[PDB]
Design a binder for this molecule. Sequence first.
Ligand SMILES: *[C@@H]1O[C@H](CO)[C@@H](O)[C@H](O)[C@H]1NC(C)=O
Ligand SMILES: *[C@@H]1O[C@H](CO)[C@@H](O)[C@H](O)[C@H]1NC(C)=O
Ligand SMILES: *[C@@H]1O[C@H](CO)[C@@H](O)[C@H](O)[C@H]1NC(C)=O
Ligand SMILES: *[C@@H]1O[C@H](CO)[C@@H](O)[C@H](O)[C@H]1NC(C)=O
Lengths: 163, 220
Amino acid sequence: FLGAAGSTMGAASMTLTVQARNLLSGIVQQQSNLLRAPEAQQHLLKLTVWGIKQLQARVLAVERYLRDQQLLGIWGCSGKLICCTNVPWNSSWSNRNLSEIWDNMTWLQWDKEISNYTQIIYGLLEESQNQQEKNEQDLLALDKWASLWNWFDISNWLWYIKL
Amino acid sequence: QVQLVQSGAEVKRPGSSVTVSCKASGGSFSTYALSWVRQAPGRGLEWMGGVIPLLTITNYAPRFQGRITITADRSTSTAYLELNSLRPEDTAVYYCAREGTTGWGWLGKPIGAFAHWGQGTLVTVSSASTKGPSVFPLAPGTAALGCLVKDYFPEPVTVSWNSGALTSGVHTFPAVLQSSGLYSLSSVVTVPSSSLGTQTYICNVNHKPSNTKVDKKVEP
Ligand SMILES: *[C@@H]1O[C@H](CO)[C@@H](O)[C@H](O)[C@H]1NC(C)=O
Ligand SMILES: *[C@@H]1O[C@H](CO)[C@@H](O)[C@H](O)[C@H]1NC(C)=O
Ligand SMILES: *[C@@H]1O[C@H](CO)[C@@H](O)[C@H](O)[C@H]1NC(C)=O
Ligand SMILES: *[C@@H]1O[C@H](CO)[C@@H](O)[C@H](O)[C@H]1NC(C)=O
């Protein structure tokens, strides 16, 4: 758990060659102590201090551990720890080196890199996930001459892979 | 659509080898399993084996393996089949056939079925050399009559009576790979007896590699 958070993303390529270095199971399974005994107590005591504080901590952890599942649902990535997107690296202005990023930079320094535009990326991702991709899938059950043979866009469709 | 313009039929000495082509047109020469099938001229149909041009995957025959050779040459965009040991029991029609795809096109998901096809040519070995036959009045209310195009080389001839003016009631009969090294053929029609000397029934034959197209009397 967190065992190589200080490593660079190349040595934290080690982290995501294992279960993101056990981060998600440490998110949901560190509940197990307050899961093991909110109920082993058989005592009256006539009032409860933890009856609001533990409950607020518990449902705080649950809503935080559901917002991220819903956000992975909204970008077609539900289930998959590592998935790719159709959004390109846009005009976003931290354009830099591949062998600088995934060799010599930690995850925290990387968060300090792109602390801006993060909500821009989050708004940007679902656009290519939905507004054309879901509408293309809605097209993909019926089409005219073009679906088998449009002979125009296909070269550009090959060209997207090409450029 | 997908067009498979196969190369023409062939005559060749027996005991030698044979090559045939199948030039596709439309769709894609690669990324879809072109294949090859047989049918003896009168039998049902028979699959032999195929090729996949992007990865040269050859899925050959259960019996003809070792004697069959299929290639795929995308740089001139054709597909050849090379069989060996030509013989009277290699005589079959050889259709070249491509797998189809879902939707009206040639790019989507394939189906697994031989949807688009080619014209096919009968791959029949030759024993003898060419021969122009002779055509006869075969003598019989209703007088029967024939023009026996018998013991020729090679197949086929056609028969039309009075330059095709008589068109109804025709009954041709197919050419035979007979037991003489040559080929024979029969063809009859139905005329009355009383119109023997009035309407002269003149069959017309078309033997194109032997070059004999004669008008022939039938006045029995
Ligand atoms: C810390 O960084 C050094 C690089 O000098 C590396 O050798 C070491 O493995 C790193 N430690 C961990 C726990 O990743
Ligand atoms: C990427 O960064 C490394 C230093 O981390 C450098 O050695 C390499 O030359 C860079 N590559 C490019 C293409 O700039
Ligand atoms: C590479 O990493 C080491 C330690 O992790 C650091 O001292 C060095 O400055 C880094 N170099 C670059 C170009 O990032
Ligand atoms: C990122 O956003 C912060 C807002 O807190 C801003 O101060 C900073 O200039 C931005 N740009 C960076 C760190 O390049």
